[PDB]
Structures are given as structure tokens and as C-alpha cells.
Amino acid sequence: MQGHPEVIDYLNTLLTGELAARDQYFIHSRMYEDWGFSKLYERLNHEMEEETQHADALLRRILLLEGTPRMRPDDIHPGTTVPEMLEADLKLERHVRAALAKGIALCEQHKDFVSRDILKAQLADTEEDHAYWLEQQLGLIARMGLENYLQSQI
Amino acid sequence: MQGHPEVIDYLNTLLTGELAARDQYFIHSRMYEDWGFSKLYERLNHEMEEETQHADALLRRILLLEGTPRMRPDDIHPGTTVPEMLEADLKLERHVRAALAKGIALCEQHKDFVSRDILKAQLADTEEDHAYWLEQQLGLIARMGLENYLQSQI
Amino acid sequence: MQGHPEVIDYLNTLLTGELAARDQYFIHSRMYEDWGFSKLYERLNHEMEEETQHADALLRRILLLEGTPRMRPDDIHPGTTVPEMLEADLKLERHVRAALAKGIALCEQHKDFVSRDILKAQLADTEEDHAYWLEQQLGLIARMGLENYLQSQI
Amino acid sequence: MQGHPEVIDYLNTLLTGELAARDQYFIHSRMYEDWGFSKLYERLNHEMEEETQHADALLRRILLLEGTPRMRPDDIHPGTTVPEMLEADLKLERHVRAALAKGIALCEQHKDFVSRDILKAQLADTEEDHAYWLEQQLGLIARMGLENYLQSQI
Amino acid sequence: MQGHPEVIDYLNTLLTGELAARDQYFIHSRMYEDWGFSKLYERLNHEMEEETQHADALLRRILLLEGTPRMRPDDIHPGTTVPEMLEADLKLERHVRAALAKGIALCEQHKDFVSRDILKAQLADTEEDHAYWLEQQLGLIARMGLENYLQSQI
Amino acid sequence: MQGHPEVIDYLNTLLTGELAARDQYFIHSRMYEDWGFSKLYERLNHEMEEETQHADALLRRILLLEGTPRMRPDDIHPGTTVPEMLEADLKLERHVRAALAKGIALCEQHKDFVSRDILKAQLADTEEDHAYWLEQQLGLIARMGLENYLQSQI
Amino acid sequence: MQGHPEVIDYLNTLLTGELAARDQYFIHSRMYEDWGFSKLYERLNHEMEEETQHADALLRRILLLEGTPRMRPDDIHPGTTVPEMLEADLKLERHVRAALAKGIALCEQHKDFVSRDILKAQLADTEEDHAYWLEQQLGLIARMGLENYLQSQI
Amino acid sequence: MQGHPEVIDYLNTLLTGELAARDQYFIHSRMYEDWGFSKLYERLNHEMEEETQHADALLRRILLLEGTPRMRPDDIHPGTTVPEMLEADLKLERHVRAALAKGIALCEQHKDFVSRDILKAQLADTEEDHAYWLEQQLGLIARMGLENYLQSQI
Amino acid sequence: MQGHPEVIDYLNTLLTGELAARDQYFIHSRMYEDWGFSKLYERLNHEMEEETQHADALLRRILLLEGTPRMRPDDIHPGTTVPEMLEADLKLERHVRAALAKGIALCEQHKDFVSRDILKAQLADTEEDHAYWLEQQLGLIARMGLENYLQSQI
Amino acid sequence: MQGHPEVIDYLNTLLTGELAARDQYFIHSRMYEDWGFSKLYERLNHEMEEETQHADALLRRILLLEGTPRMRPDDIHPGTTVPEMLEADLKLERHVRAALAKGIALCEQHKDFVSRDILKAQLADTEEDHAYWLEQQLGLIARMGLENYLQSQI
Amino acid sequence: MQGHPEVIDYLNTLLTGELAARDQYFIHSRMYEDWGFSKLYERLNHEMEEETQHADALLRRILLLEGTPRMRPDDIHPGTTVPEMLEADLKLERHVRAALAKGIALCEQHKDFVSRDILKAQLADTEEDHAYWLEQQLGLIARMGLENYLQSQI
Amino acid sequence: MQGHPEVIDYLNTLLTGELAARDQYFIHSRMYEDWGFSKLYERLNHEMEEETQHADALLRRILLLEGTPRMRPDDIHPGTTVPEMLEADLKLERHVRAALAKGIALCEQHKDFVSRDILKAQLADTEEDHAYWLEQQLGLIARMGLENYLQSQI
Numbered sequence A, B, C, D, E, F, G, H, I, J, K, L: 001m002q003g004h005p006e007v008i009d010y011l012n013t014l015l016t017g018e019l020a021a022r023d024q025y026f027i028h029s030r031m032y033e034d035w036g037f038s039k040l041y042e043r044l045n046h047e048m049e050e051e052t053q054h055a056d057a058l059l060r061r062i063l064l065l066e067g068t069p070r071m072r073p074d075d076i077h078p079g080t081t082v083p084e085m086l087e088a089d090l091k092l093e094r095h096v097r098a099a100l101a102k103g104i105a106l107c108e109q110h111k112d113f114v115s116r117d118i119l120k121a122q123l124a125d126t127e128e129d130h131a132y133w134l135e136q137q138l139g140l141i142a143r144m145g146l147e148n149y150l151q152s153q154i
């Protein structure tokens, strides 16, 4: 099916952002594991797998619309401490949230309602699983202190 | 069965207090969950379900006695921090305890012994599950400090 | 995540309407049970539990958006006979339907597409489970008469 | 254990009333069955078995207190039509309710709290199973007419 | 296998009548469901599935005989009330019965005995499942009145 | 619930197109089976059943909105060879895709968001199951030739 | 039971044709197996077993009618290549189809309706299993070429 | 469905013959049992149950056609010895065979093809189960003598 | 919860009496076992475990009410023969019965209805399990003589 | 453990090549799926998962050695036809094979034998699963032609 | 098989170091258990069992090569506090790592490749299980403080 | 993959030695069985199967490297008595051990690390299963005498 060149281009933009998020979680999860925080490792490993499904859904949708997917992830910027890692992930999902919202309006505008629903599904994940869980972790650090928090994540 | 208009009126008073307690636990449990304290979420969610059964028992008993149940919850006053939430719940159960004790005497006085037994059952719950668990949590905060306490509730 | 103060305010409006619907079904179901109509009791009891999930979803969504949920149910207006109860429930769902439709447009306007999808899910329930089942019951009364209808609900 | 001669005498009074209720349900249930109303047969047969347990509990309690149980049932007065049978059963449980309430006060007065709790248990049954179910059946007849009601009890 | 052009033409006539019956049951069953008569919904839904198998058998038989099936259903004429729907279905099966009988004679005449047996199988269904069940429902309405009948179909 | 006469009219238009698609798949699947291509038979038989669910959902939705469903399928135009059949099905789904997109905009415009979501669900099916599978089959023919392709579908 | 000498004679004619078909499939299936076409072997082996049941049914029916079955198969004429084998089998079933049709008319004429039903059952098999499957195989050869076809039958 | 008065009349004739056959087998089977021939008892008991199904099918078919079934069995004529019983049963099935054949022609003539198929089913039973089994038993007596035969039936 | 200093003091009095009863049963059961009366051993061992639960319930209730439990058992006075042991246990439960009755009145007077219900539960045990079983054993000795009685308890 | 800065740097080089291979297989597998070659999709999807484990092992090993992993994949160069895709994958694994061989010598030289064994494990995979399977597919195309090959991969 | 006297001598050196590590873990694990740190006990107990397998593999390999194993463990130097114990274990594994690396080069030099592979297996364990887990524990102490760390190991 | 002509040539040399070892064990095992030593038969039969896997791994590896495997086994030299057979097998594995060691160095030299790992795996088998088991058997003969040894192998 030949999709709208603007829609395809912006799915591609979203795709390189999802490939990035996948890779940022890949490195963060393994950093968490190396440091001995199994619970952060398991959660970031899970988010890595979800980002991989978000990427997959965009990639297949671009192929269906007869586009050529852009496979280079955006640049990632990993933290070097637990608080910087959480903050770097929160900044990434904030950016992804804003990109998706704009894609959603753009799909409405070109009357690509199926691409729009794909983006809306991913936006719910970004807001309600990923972004909310991150704010939650920063919230715990704020409430019990970093040391107590990190103990709880072993 | 036509019940004593005073008994029915005071069951109704208890009913609007139980509807309130249900709703106060509803909001507190979900606040606890939003902040990442799954264990407080599970316990307040459980107390919400119990308050719903306390309300149900009063409502059905008022209908059996051919009264018209009052379905407006009393005003609730949720906390904004973990210690204020626990304190607001403790103040609510203290009020409920005192209301029940007076209802129990009033049922004895109008010779409604079945309504009395319903209130006595709920009073045991209020004292021995709900009030005692709350004093217990404040007691833990007092003994290990708020940060350690909150860590234990993740 | 900081949501749009107008969106949060209107979710709050919807929330106090869902708390109300929950409570209206609570009293109607138990009235049906007291009168011996087990089948109306079971159905209204079920709708009460669904309204409780509708309320829960709004409440959590308001908390995620960093709003303060309004926990006072709207005023309810229960019937005193089977036909008035059904009519009072139909008028409630008609009002809820119209409120949701307006919320849906408002979320689109502030580009809160995830809140919008939450409201759309609840609107489908309101129209296709709840409103349609009520019109259905009035339709049966109209077709076989109230006495035959009530017999069938024992 | 030697019980208070007044308490024993009044348990005995309650006992001959429970033996009566047992026998009134015995005849009503079998009349219902003979006429083809299996559902009234099953319910009255069940109430007959419950009255037999109420009688048993009083009888054993009188023996424990070193009294001599009075085994003659009170006179019973069965109906000859479905509405008269329901009304005769409702009048019986109303009388039993009032007798129990007075026994409960009398046990409190002689400080026989265990006999009192036995009577309170039976009073809850009389009010909430038996009396409420009967008012319920008359209520159904009133709402759908006797013919529709009787059809539903086949 | 090259079938007789007259046989193929008349199978085609039967086929467009079966496609019609399928569609008339499709709409009637869903109308019954919308009105709350689950038992009429289930029965008409079942007849819809059977008409679909009758259509399928004719279609495949026409293809085997190297004909081109006519896929346009005949015009259908749904009722707007329960009695008109039953009557419209009875008139349809009466027409189908007569068409089949004539097809059966026509197959005998062109010595297509396998097409004949297919039509005879469907005729038994039309007479003994479908037509007989419809006369039966009208018969019940006639015997107990429409209101009682409709109550029994909830 | 009284729906917007324009929305109902256009659901009806979509309904007669879905009834058509159902029937076009009905004939194509059985043609495939007659020729010995079991795998095309199974896939078209499956699409026939899905079109039947698409039709069902529109029909019920029109009834809920108090419309009168139009039950005449649009005209269908079956192929006479495997490549023409695939092309005729692709042209049908292209038309259905465009009709749905316009219905989706029309529902948004009359603020019928539940009808809109029904159409969006079906559009995803049309694009991602049905249209994509057809382009896929033509793509295989183009890549390996018609003879090799048809061999693979036995 | 003494059957009509003409009916018995013609059952006997059909019997020697079924014995023949059995034997033609016997040799074809084993030729297919020798050449490595397991799928043609399995299908012809199956048809051989079915012809054996067709023969059995005629033989027993002739014995019941107090006839003497003729046990010499007609002459068979096996192919020497896959296309000639399929064509030789198609010519055999065409002959059997015509013989059965005439037997069916002859049984009707002597009022032997049970022999007639036996022949009708076998005619349905000849047309709808056997003849249709053969035309189908020739159809596949015509559509994908002999080499591709034979590959698919390994 | 209003059937042809001649068809109904002749189904009725067949029905009184099947009721008779049922009763003749009833008495023969129990005579066989009384004499100690369990195997003849079991077989005649089985034929009695089959005749009861033949009767049932005619009776229901006459009711469907809006006839009044004739429920008086024809006169029966039981044997007094094993060979006379077998012969009396063989004469009965011979008569039934001839009656059915004529009914079958009569149904064809009034174009009642479903009644015809019912009669054809029963004719196959009469010829191939019942008549053939009886000739078989007489055949065994002829081949091994009556004494050996009767020994084998204990 | 701060309980009434008088209620707490008297729970404490009851507690030291229950600790005593536990210990009196402890020694009696093991004396019974040493002498070879397994059945008296098992019953007194069971009563020891029940007294331990009675003690536990008082102790926890005193702690909940912010009292300091008194953990010294009252003085016990074990028998030296089977009849003196039974009599010493009967005198203990008589004393416990009277203490509980007075506690029950005292709780009513300070409006501690939950402590009251705890005492009422234990009073039922004291009267209906423990006291009644003891009178029962003395009753058996009186009826069959001590030797026969003791034989039955091996 | 502080690893040799040269070893870490070259693991990092290998890591960005494995991230690339993962992504090249990601796009190729989904391209294969879009075109209808399920078997190529499943195999490339599998190789994608294996490359992800190769990447994971390098990443964790770099972290253990206190290096900072480089998370940017090398540039990838996907094919646009089945033969170009296979060739692009073969060229990638040839490059990976040569890079690994050099890493293996480099680890030997810095006496990092555990990193060396990690690289040797991956080299066996690259040669014996991945490279050998690709040469194999090109070999099949060469032997049976591209069309036959692609048919076999549906 | 007669091994190289230098290889055997150095396996022996490694063996007395593994016997030592086994014994150092033996004492540390039991010290951890005595202090109440079950999780450190379980982990050190596990490492003790692994060191025992490392020792076993060296011992058997020396015997196979016709050497005489040296069974005296090296001197061990246990800590007296949790941080000194972890540090003493880390210093031991650092020494073992360096000894193994040199043994690996020495086996390569005498062309004993099987002894070399044994040492490489143990080196991977020393680096990736044992050394990495120890650095990990010190890392946790550094991140959350010793008290929080020790709490987590109870 | 094109391997180094020297590596391929020497794998080929190893291959003809493994084919030989397979065949030497083949004859020895069956000689052992013929003489009644089931335990030597089972062990040599097992070594024959292992040599067959060693051969297989070399053969496949040579094919992967685009070499032509040499399939002629080296000359074998079986014993004629149990001690000569064991000695002939020990001399064979000694030769294989030395050949492998040289192949391992040669693979290192041409940077074929995967062939090297294949040879190292087989060398461990040759030394630790095969050579060690043989020395072991000679050792037993030396310790208990040949007669006792052979008895133990029945």
C-alpha cells in the first residue's frame, strides 16, 4: 500500500528514536547488573524488550506502506551513576512522548488512522509504563534517600 | 419488618461514614501505588474492600428494616504525605469506633439486638484489623524512622 | 508528568460522575435483591463493579498527571419502583455519555491522546453494555408488560 | 450446671414454639409439593430443617442447665391457600421474633450470657433468613400478581 | 463434469434463495438480540449458519458441474415485530419448500440423481427443522398469548 | 440510543460493502477448493468468516443506534483465474479502505466516537491482514512465477 | 428375498465394473509408489479400498436378492505415464457414472427402491470424490505444468 | 404444513402396521425368553425397539403434516412354535415391504419427497435387517436341523 | 488504643486464671498418661491447648489496649486421684465461669463491647465444652462405677 | 578488574559490529516477512536474536573489565532483493570473521585468555551457523534457480 | 600418560592454591553464618564447593599425567570483619587469576593443550563468578554504606 | 569458506586416522563379544561410536572449508589376545594424541582457531576417556593378574 511520504518519513524518525531507546536500556540494564542491582537489571531488561517491540511495530508498518526503514538509532547518552541513568531515561521518554504526540497529529492530518493507532498504543506505554515507573523511582529516592533506595534494588 | 425510626436513622449515619471510609482508602491506596509503595497499596486496597462490605451490611440491614438508605458519603480528608495519610486514616477509624459504640448502646436501648450484633462485628474489625494495623505502622515509623519504614513498603 | 490543568479538571468532573454511578448501582442492586429480583441484583451488582473500575482508571490517570482527584460523588437520585430505577439509571448513563463525548473532544484539543483513549474505552462501555442493556429492559417491559417482565427477573 | 429456673422456663417456652415452627413448615412444604410448587417445597423443607436445629440447640441448652425440656409443640395454624400459608408463616415468625427479643432481655437480666447468645443467633435467622424471605414472597405476589408468582414457583 | 444447463440454472436459482434466507436470519437474529430475546437470537443464529451450509452445498455442486454460481441473494423482506418476523420467515421457507420440490422433479427429469439428493436433504431440513419450528412458535403465541410467549424467549 | 441519521446511513453503506466482501470470498474460496488449491481455499474461507464478523459488528451497531440495516450486498465481481481473483479481491479491499477512512472522518465530525473506533478496528484488519496478504500473494507470483506460486498453494 | 432378474443382472454388471475399478486402482497406486509419488500412491490406495467397498455392497445386495454374483472384473486398461493413468481412471469413472445412472432408472422402474439407494450412494462417491478429484489433478497439471505437479506429489 | 390427504391416510395405514409389528415382536421375544432362548429374546427385543422407532417416525411425520394419527395396531397373528413364530414374522415383514413400496410410489406421485425418504429408510431396514435376518434363521434350521438350531439360541 | 484501666486490670485477672487453667491441664493430662489412661490424656491435652488460646486472646487484647499483661498464673491445686482431678478441674471452671460473667458485665459498663465479645466466646467454651464434659465424666462414674469408668478411658 | 586498554578498545570495536549485525538481520527478517517468505523471516529472526546475545556477551565483558561500551552500531547496508540481502549478510559475516580472528590474536598477546575464549565461541557461531548457512542458501539458488529456491522459502 | 615435569609441578602449585581457597571460603562462610548473614553464608558455601571442584579437576589431571599431587593447602589469611573478609577473598582470587594466566602460558609452551583448557575453564570462573561477585559486594558497600549492605545480607 | 590448503590437508590426515580408530574398535569390540567379555564389548563398542563422531566432526569441518575429505582409513593392526588388543589400542591413541597436538599448533599458526578448538575437544577425549581408560585396564591386569581381570570383564 503506498503510504504518504510525510507519514513514512516521520515513522522513520520515531523508529530511529525507538532503536535508540532499546540500546540505552540495553546498556543501562547491564550496567545495573554489573553493579549488583538485579531488580534494576530486570526492569531495564524488560523495557529493552518492549522498545524492541515498539521498533518492530514501526519497522513493519513502514515496510507495509512501501517505505524504506531508517535503521540507524539516534545518539544515546547513558548515565554514569544510578541517579543520572534514571534521569537520562526520563529525558529520553519525555522526548519520545513529545515526538509521538506530534506523529499522532500528523497521521490524523494525512488520514492514516492505522499508523495513528500504532503511535497511540506506544504513547500509552511510554506514559503509563515507562515514564511513570521512572518518575516513581526518582520519587522513591527523594522519599527514603539514595542509599535506602539502592539497597531495595539489590 | 418495620424498624425503629431512630435505629434506622443512626444506621444511616454509620452508613455514610462507611461509604466515606471506603472512599478515603480508595484514594489513599492509589496514591500509595502511584508513589511506588505496593505494600501500602495492597493493604489500603484490602481495607477499601472491607469498608465496602461494612457499608453493604448496613445498607441491606436498613432496607430490611424498611428504611431508605442515605447514600452520600461523609466528607473525607486525605493526607498529602505518608505520615499524614496514616494519621488521617487513624483519625477516621477513631471516629468510626466512637460512632459504633454509641450505635451499639442505642440498639440495645431499642431492643434491636440483630442490628446491634452487626455493629459489634464491624467494631471488632475497626479496632482489631484497621485501628491496630494503623497504630502499628506509626509505631514502626517511630522505631526505625520514616525512611527505613518507607523502604520496607516498596 | 504534569497534565493540562483543564484536562485534569474535567477528568475530575468525570470521576465524581463515575463515583456517583457506582453508588447509584450499589443502592439499586441491593433494593432489587431485597425485593427478590436476583437477576436484577446480579446485573446491577456487576455494573457497580464496572463503574468502580471506571472510577479507578480516572483516579489513577489524574494522579499520574499530578492532579488531585475529587473524591465526592455527584448527587444520586435512586428510583422507588422497578420502572423508575431503570429510568433513573438510563438518565444517568445518558448524562455520562454526553460528558464523556465532550471530554473526548477536550482531550483531543489539548493533545492528551492517552486520556482521550481512556475516555473512549469507557464511552464504549457506557453505550454498548450499560445504556443498551437498560433500553433493552424497558423494551422488554413495553413488549410483555411489567408483571411478566418482573417475573422473569426473580 | 444449675441454670436459673426462670431462664430454663422461658427456653422451654421458646422450645415449644420452635417445635411448632418445625411442624408448620413440615405440613406447608408437603402441601406445596402436593400442589406442584417444587421451589416452595424446597424452601419450606429447608426452613423445617433449620427450625429443627433451632429446637435442638434450645433442647440441649435446657439439658445442660439441668432443666427438663417441654416437648409439646405449640398449636399450629396452617393456611389452605398459597397466600394464607405465607401469611400464617409470617405471623409465626413475627411471634417468634418478639418471644426471642424478650428472652434475650431476660437472659441479660439473669446474667446467662451464653443462653442469650444462643437466642441472638436464632433471632438473626428469624429476621434475616425466614422473616425477610416471607415478606419477599408476599412482595413478589404484590408486584407481579399471584398467578405469575405461582408459575415461577413450579 | 459438465452438468445439464437447465439443472445448473435452477441450482443457481435455489442458491440465490439460500443466500437470501441466510441474510434474512442474519438480520432477524440480531434484531432479536437487540430486543433482549436471547433464545430467539440463538435459534435464528443457528438457522443462519444452516442456510450458510445449504448455500455452500449448492455453490460447490454448481462449480463441480462446471457452472458459474449466481452470488446475488434474492430480495429479503424482514419483519418489524416478533410476530411479523416469524411470519416473514415462514413465508420464506414455504417458498423455499416449493422451489426445492420443483428442483427435485427437474433433477429427476435430467437424470442428475446426485443434485437431486442434495436438494432432498435440504428439503428435509426446510420442512422438519425450519418450517416446523416456525409453525411451532406461532402455535405457542396462539396458545399462551404473545406476552407470555415473549417472556419465555428472554 | 438515537444515532445521527448521516452516521447510520454511512454505516449502512459500509455494511452492504462488507456483505459483498463476505460473498466475494465465499465464491473465491470455493473456486480455489474446486481447483485443488487447499491453501487458498483455507485463507479465503478465513477471510470470509472475518468479513462476516465485520458485517455483524456494523449491523449490531446500526440497530443499537436505532437505524434499519440495509441487507443487500453491493454487486460483486469475481475473477475467473487465480491472478484475476487476487486482483479483484485487492481492488475490493482498496475500495473498502477508502470507504472506511471517509466513515472515520464522518464519525469524528458527528462526535460518534464509538462508531469511529469500530471502523478503525476494521480498517486495521483491511490494511494489515487482508490488503497486505493480497499484495503479498501478487508479490510472490511476481518473484517466482505463477506456476511455482500455484504449486505452493496446493 | 427374490429380486427382479433384470435388476440382479444389472447389479452384476455394475459389480464386474467395480471389481475392475478396484484392480485398476490397485495397479495404478503401486505404479505411483514404485515411481516415488507417495501422495498419488496414498490416494489411489484409498480409492482402491473404496471400490472394494462399492463391490462388497453390490455383491451382498445380489446375494440378499438370491442372485449369483458375477465375480470376473471387466477388462482394465492402465496408463503407462502419470497423465495417461489419470486419464484412464477418469474414463473409467465416466463409464461407471453412466452405468450407475442407468441402473438407478432401472431400479426405479422395477420398484426396487433399496437397490436404487445403494446405487445413488455409489454415484455420489463416483462424482464427488473420485471423478472430481481426477479432473482436479488434470486441472493442476494444466495450471502449473506436469513437472511442477509431479514434484508436489512426491 | 398441510400434507396431501392421501399421503396422510396411507402413512396412517403404515403406522398401524408398524404398531402391529412392534407388538408381534413384543410377544414373540417374551415367548422366546420364557422358553429359555436368550438369543432369540435379545434379537426380537431389539426388533421390537426398532419397530417402535419406525412407528414413532411415521407418527411424528403425520402430526407435522397436520394429520390425526391412527393409533390402533393391525391384528397380529403370533406363532406357537419356534418355526411358526419365525414364519409369522417373515410373513409380516413381507407385507410391510410391499406396503412401503406402494407408499413410496404414492409419495413420489404427490410430490411429498420427505415422506418418501422416511419410507425408503424404513424399507431398507425391513429388507436388510429384519427380512434378511429371518430368512437367515429359517436357512439355518434347514441346514443343521431344528434341534441343533434351537440349541444354538439358548 | 488506650483501654479503660479497670477493664485492663480485670482482663489481667482473667489472664492469670487462664494461664493457671492451662497449667492445671498440663499436669493432669500428663498424670493421666503416666497412669495409662490415653483417652483422659488426649482430652486434657486438648483442653490445655484451648486454655492456651484463651490466654493468648486475653494477652493480645490487653496489649492492643496498651496494658501490661500479668504473666503469673494463679496458684493451681491438682488432684491425686482420678476423681479428685476431675473435681479440681470442675471447681476451676466454675470459678472461671463466675469470673467471666462478672468481666462481661464490667465490659458492658465501660462500653468495651469488643473485650466483652472475647469474654463471651470464652464463657461459651467454659460452659459448653469444658464444664459440661467434666460433669459428664463424674456422671459416668456415678452411673457405672469408678472401675468401669476408668477401664473405658484406657 | 582493570582490563588492558587495547583489549577493551577492540572488544568495543567488535561490539559495534555485533550491534550492526543484529540490526541488519532485524531489517532483513522483516523484509522477508513482508514479502511472504516465512522461512527466511524465521531464520533471520533467529540470527537477529543470536547477534543480540553476541553483543550482550561483549558488552558485559567490557563492563567487567571496567571499560565503557561503545553502543553505536556500525553502518549497515541492507539488500533490496533476496539475492542482494543474502550477499550483504555474507559480506557482513566475512568481515566479522576476520575482525574476530584478529581480536583472538590480540587477546592472546595481552594474556586476556577469558576474552579470547568469548571471541572464539562467537567465531565458531559466525563460521558454522551463520556463514555456512548463507553460503548454503546461495548454493541452493545456484543449483535449482532463484524461483524454485524462493518457492521453497514461503 | 607421562606429563611434562614442569607442567605437573605448576599444576601442583595451582592445586595447593585451590585447596587454600576452598578452606578460606570454608571459614568465611561459617563466620558469616555465625554472625547471622545467611546470604553471605550461602554464597561463600557455594564458592567453597566450586573451589573443591577446581581442586578436584587439578588433582585428577596431575594423577592422569603420572604426577604426585601436593595436598598441603597454601597458608590462608581470613578477615575478622565483613569488609576485611571480602578484601581477603578478592586478594586471593587476584593471586589465583595471575597464577592461572602464567600456567596457561606454560601449558601452551609445553604443548599440553588439555591441561591448558582445564586452567582456562577455571580462570573464567575466577574472573566471572568469583572475582566479579566480590568487586560487586564492595561496590554495593561503597554505594549504600556498610550498614545498609549488611542488612541486605541477613 | 575457503580454508588454508595446509590445514585442510592435515584435517584429512587426522580424518583417515579417526576412520582407522573407528574400525580398530569395531573389530576389537566384536572379538571381545565373540570371546564372551560383554563388558569389553560394550566399552569398545562405545569407543567405536565416539571415533565415528570424531571422524564426522573432521569430515564436516573439511567440507565447510571447501576441501575434499580423504575417506580411506589408515591401516589398522588388531591384537590377537586381550593384552595385545589393549596394547594395540593404546599405541593407536598415543599416535592420535601426538598427531592432534601437532594439528593444534598448525591451526594456531594459520589462524584457523575454530578447527583448532575442534582438535582440542577431540584431544581431551583421546587423553581423558580413551587413553586413560586403556592404561587403566593394563594397570588392573598388572595388579590382579590377567585371569582375575578377564573374569571381571565377562
Ligand SMILES: [Fe+3]
Binding pocket: A018, A021, A050, A051, A054, A096, A122, A125, A126
Ligand atoms: Fe517506546
Ligand SMILES: [Fe+3]
Binding pocket: A047, A051, A093, A125, A126, A130, A131
Ligand atoms: Fe518506554
Ligand SMILES: [Fe+3]
Binding pocket: A050, A125, A129, A130
Ligand atoms: Fe511497560
Ligand SMILES: [Fe+3]
Binding pocket: B018, B021, B050, B051, B054, B096, B122, B125, B126
Ligand atoms: Fe468500617
Ligand SMILES: [Fe+3]
Binding pocket: B047, B051, B093, B125, B126, B130, B131
Ligand atoms: Fe476499618
Ligand SMILES: [Fe+3]
Binding pocket: B050, B125, B129, B130
Ligand atoms: Fe481487617
Ligand SMILES: [Fe+3]
Binding pocket: C018, C021, C050, C051, C054, C096, C122, C125, C126
Ligand atoms: Fe461508567
Ligand SMILES: [Fe+3]
Binding pocket: C047, C051, C093, C125, C126, C130, C131
Ligand atoms: Fe455504565
Ligand SMILES: [Fe+3]
Binding pocket: C050, C125, C129, C130
Ligand atoms: Fe458492561
Ligand SMILES: [Fe+3]
Binding pocket: D018, D021, D050, D051, D054, D096, D122, D125, D126
Ligand atoms: Fe426458628
Ligand SMILES: [Fe+3]
Binding pocket: D047, D051, D093, D125, D126, D130, D131
Ligand atoms: Fe425461621
Ligand SMILES: [Fe+3]
Binding pocket: D050, D125, D129, D130
Ligand atoms: Fe435461613
Ligand SMILES: [Fe+3]
Binding pocket: E018, E021, E050, E051, E054, E096, E122, E125, E126
Ligand atoms: Fe435452507
Ligand SMILES: [Fe+3]
Binding pocket: E047, E051, E093, E125, E126, E130, E131
Ligand atoms: Fe431452513
Ligand SMILES: [Fe+3]
Binding pocket: E050, E125, E129, E130
Ligand atoms: Fe435445523
Ligand SMILES: [Fe+3]
Binding pocket: F018, F021, F050, F051, F054, F096, F122, F125, F126
Ligand atoms: Fe472487512
